[PDB]
Design an enzyme around this catalytic site. Structure first.
Site, PDB file in Angstrom:
ATOM      1  N   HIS A 260     -93.457  19.378 -25.503  1.00  0.00           N
ATOM      2  CA  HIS A 260     -92.349  20.193 -25.746  1.00  0.00           C
ATOM      3  C   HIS A 260     -91.702  19.498 -26.996  1.00  0.00           C
ATOM      4  O   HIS A 260     -90.385  19.756 -27.108  1.00  0.00           O
ATOM      5  CB  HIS A 260     -91.415  20.760 -24.691  1.00  0.00           C
ATOM      6  N   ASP A 323     -91.994  17.873 -18.566  1.00  0.00           N
ATOM      7  CA  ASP A 323     -93.028  19.107 -18.395  1.00  0.00           C
ATOM      8  C   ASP A 323     -94.111  19.414 -19.266  1.00  0.00           C
ATOM      9  O   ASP A 323     -93.812  19.354 -20.538  1.00  0.00           O
ATOM     10  CB  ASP A 323     -92.244  20.509 -17.768  1.00  0.00           C
ATOM     11  N   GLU A 324     -95.365  20.063 -18.678  1.00  0.00           N
ATOM     12  CA  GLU A 324     -96.366  20.498 -19.657  1.00  0.00           C
ATOM     13  C   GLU A 324     -96.696  19.538 -20.884  1.00  0.00           C
ATOM     14  O   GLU A 324     -97.014  20.085 -22.048  1.00  0.00           O
ATOM     15  CB  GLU A 324     -95.850  21.929 -19.978  1.00  0.00           C
ATOM     16  N   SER A 325     -96.884  18.332 -20.626  1.00  0.00           N
ATOM     17  CA  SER A 325     -97.441  17.287 -21.374  1.00  0.00           C
ATOM     18  C   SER A 325     -99.083  17.247 -21.429  1.00  0.00           C
ATOM     19  O   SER A 325     -99.660  16.377 -21.335  1.00  0.00           O
ATOM     20  CB  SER A 325     -97.102  15.922 -21.172  1.00  0.00           C
TER      21      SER A 325
END
Ligand SMILES: CC(=O)N[C@H]1/C(=N/OC(=O)Nc2ccccc2)O[C@H](CO)[C@@H](O)[C@@H]1O
Length: 504
Positions: A260, A323-325
């Site tokens: 992100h 998050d969401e790497s």
């Protein structure tokens, strides 16, 4: 015995009479009433002169609110000898069992007396006091034709969870300092005590970093859908922190990493393997962006950012995301998050991170997990390491549509109406953990205006706020729903552009 769940109300939403939300530990009403008149003063008395001075500021905040709707000019007095018709705020003889945020609030015919352990608890108690006065009291302009009465009553209260927060995403769409202050203010009235700012993501970077000025000059200049974006100077961030501090709200800033991160990657080419700036992104995809986990420039960047943010953020916590790497390998994520935790700790800050950040071998038991996934295996690491956990299940994802037909919101966690936002317990997310508390997350992919924020947070946040404050044994949808109907005019009076949910 016969039981049932709630359906939609026939014929549409429903959206002397106090309307306390969240529900307090106890509330009894007796005969008689207190009348707030133009000659009322607020008296404050603490255990020493320093504490009395803090209570004086709290009193003044309360007087300001009362004066706006009554048209009175109630002033505040440092004295432990309140006069008939007075409101009295004191920490002398507080019940220790009620903790830092607890209070007794006893209203007699001659006097309102709020007794707490700490100034913080007087502040939380004042939110209840405002709800004991007639609807109309929460107006921002003078209300005529309403007698300002409070029933003779006895309330004792304290929170179930220590952490009761709201996150606002200002990266996807930017909101002004005034807009942010308003949401902080509104949430404080429902005993929310933590404000998490999601200050950076793929579509924008919102915090001035003097050592890396292009984060603003380039990275702040857009948002989802291609508007102009915006940012906070460090002076503006300090102002937000100060405004929150007056409400005993801790501000936890988030710089999301290593994923992100497109806005940073679009600002500085050296943060990318090929040395070129990324194009700015105005879509809503997630998961694709990554810092370089094995380049020292990455850790220099993070250290400069953390150093400047730490300097202006008194909270002992910094949120580093995680998050969401999906463009970062498990091994590199483990390594990366451990390195940035060490940097944060060297600057005197403990790290909060989204799952799966607790699995980093560099986490400590001082780190905090924000558990958004809420699966059986989530926070196995946190639990083993003795890390506190903040829960943000589907029921706390306030950016979710109320219904299939909501004109704004997402739906990847299903729909979350006012009932869904109420009927859950933090232990549904994770079992066997030290649950620090709850955080409502308002992501802003689809929210552009203040009215959009209002619509999604109200009434959903009221539901989440009660889950955080009120003990599970005392939570009941049928009860809360009827209380919410009663509360509706108060939302209207505050200028909140709430959704009139048909399930209420
Ligand atoms: C921690 C978190 O919530 N991360 C992202 C995020 N997680 O996204 C999803 O995984 N969405 C999704 C998952 C499966 C299928 C379709 C969308 O949800 C938020 C919006 O609710 C985004 O704004 C966040 O950046």
């Amino acid at each position: 015995h016969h039981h049932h769940s709630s359906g939609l109300v026939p014929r549409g939403s429903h959206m002397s009479q106090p309307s306390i939300l969240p529900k307090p530990v106890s509330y009894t009403v007796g005969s008689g009433q207190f009348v707030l008149t133009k000659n009322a003063s607020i008296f404050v008395a603490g255990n020493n002169v320093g504490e009395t001075d803090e209570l004086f500021n709290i009193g003044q905040a309360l007087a300001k609110k009362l004066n706006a709707s009554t048209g009175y000019t109630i002033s505040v007095v440092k004295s432990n000898q309140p006069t008939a018709g007075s409101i009295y705020l004191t920490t002398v003889g507080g019940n220790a069992a009620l903790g830092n945020e607890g209070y007794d609030l006893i209203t007699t015919s001659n006097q309102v007396t709020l007794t707490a352990n700490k100034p913080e608890g007087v502040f939380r108690g004042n939110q209840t006091l405002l709800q004991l006065l007639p609807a109309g009291i929460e107006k921002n302009t003078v209300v005529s034709g309403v007698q300002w009465v409070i029933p003779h009553s006895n309330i004792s209260d304290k929170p179930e969870y220590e952490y009761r927060g709201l996150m606002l995403d200002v990266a996807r769409h930017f909101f002004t300092v005034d807009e942010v202050k308003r949401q902080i203010d509104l949430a404080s009235q429902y005993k929310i005590n933590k404000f998490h700012m999601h200050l950076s993501d793929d579509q924008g970077w919102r915090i001035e970093i003097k050592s890396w000025p292009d984060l603003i000059e380039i990275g702040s200049k857009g948002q989802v859908g291609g508007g102009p974006g915006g940012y906070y100077t460090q002076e503006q961030f300090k102002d937000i922190v100060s405004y929150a501090a007056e409400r005993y709200i801790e501000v936890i800033p988030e710089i999301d990493m290593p994923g992100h991160t497109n806005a940073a990657l679009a600002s500085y080419g050296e943060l990318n393997p090929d040395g070129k700036r990324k194009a700015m992104r105005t879509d809503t995809a997630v998961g694709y962006s990554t810092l370089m986990p094995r380049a020292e420039i990455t850790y220099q960047f993070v250290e400069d950012v953390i150093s400047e943010l730490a300097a202006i953020s008194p909270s002992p916590y910094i949120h580093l995301g995680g998050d969401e790497s999906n463009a970062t390998s498990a091994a590199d994520y483990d390594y990366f998050f451990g390195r940035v935790t060490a940097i944060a700790n060297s600057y005197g800050k403990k790290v909060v991170g989204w799952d799966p950040s607790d699995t980093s071998s560099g986490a400590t038991s001082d780190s905090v997990l924000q558990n958004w996934t809420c699966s059986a295996s989530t926070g196995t690491a946190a639990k083993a390491k003795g890390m506190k956990v903040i829960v943000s299940p589907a029921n706390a994802y306030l950016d979710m549509k109320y219904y299939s037909d909501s004109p704004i919101g997402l739906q990847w966690r299903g729909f979350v109406n006012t009932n869904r936002a109420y009927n859950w317990d933090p232990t549904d997310c994770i079992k066997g953990a030290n649950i620090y508390g709850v955080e409502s997350t308002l992501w802003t992919e689809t929210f552009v205006t203040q009215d959009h924020l209002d619509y999604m947070l109200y009434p959903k946040l009221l539901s989440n706020a009660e889950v955080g404050w009120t003990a599970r044994g005392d939570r009941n949808w049928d009860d809360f729903k009827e209380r919410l109907i009663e509360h509706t005019p108060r939302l209207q009076n505050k200028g909140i552009k709430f959704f009139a949910d048909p399930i209420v």
